[PDB]
Amino acid sequence: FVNALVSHLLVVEPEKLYAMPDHLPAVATLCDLFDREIVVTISWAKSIPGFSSLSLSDQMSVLQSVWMEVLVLGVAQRSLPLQDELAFAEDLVLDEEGARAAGLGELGAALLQLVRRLQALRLEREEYVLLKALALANSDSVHIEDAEAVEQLREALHEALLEYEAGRRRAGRLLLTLPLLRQTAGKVLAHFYGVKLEGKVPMHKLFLEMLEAMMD
């Protein structure tokens, strides 16, 4: 059924993150936490129903275009209880000025903007997991080979959401938040593209790879 998908989306979700725990994820330091989050995103995408039966390239075309959305919507999800503040982990709560200090720039404001928008919906666990896999399928990349296969996966998850929004207008309301997610993700990327170019702040393998995959 459709809840067999939903309950698999619930199962496959990355565990609650903590910066300084103590059985969950090990224990980081500062921004390696973000590096870990790319990795968690990547492995998640594999586990998405329909995904791993794309070609290897389309899996990469998909990931390279929307990976930051998926990530950011995750961080939106954690920050849902708190007001005017960003839940990096459960441990890590950062306000607007907290964000500037760690060299995030204007990103605090940007990310609160998205948080507010989802807060205005009291977004649910099942609903979020459904929307994140939906964001994943909603790629937009001129590099995708099988156009139909992604579209079918897209239609599929949206139908999964519709069949769920019954146990009614909440489908679209969730969907309506997606443009801000992409825009927000894009400001995150554009920021660290400046950092990249400044070349002073050191950056880790996967993140540069993702950054470089984008312009060309």
């Binding site: 990795v39 990547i42 492995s43 594999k46 290897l56 899996q59 990469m60 990931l63 390279q64 393998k205 996967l206 790879e209 993702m210 470089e212 995959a213």
Partner: peptide, 12 residues
């Protein structure tokens, strides 16, 4: 430069 770190995870 192929997507090395990305390839790893998607094929591990």
């Amino acid at each position: 430069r192929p997507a090395s770190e990305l390839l790893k995870y998607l094929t591990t």
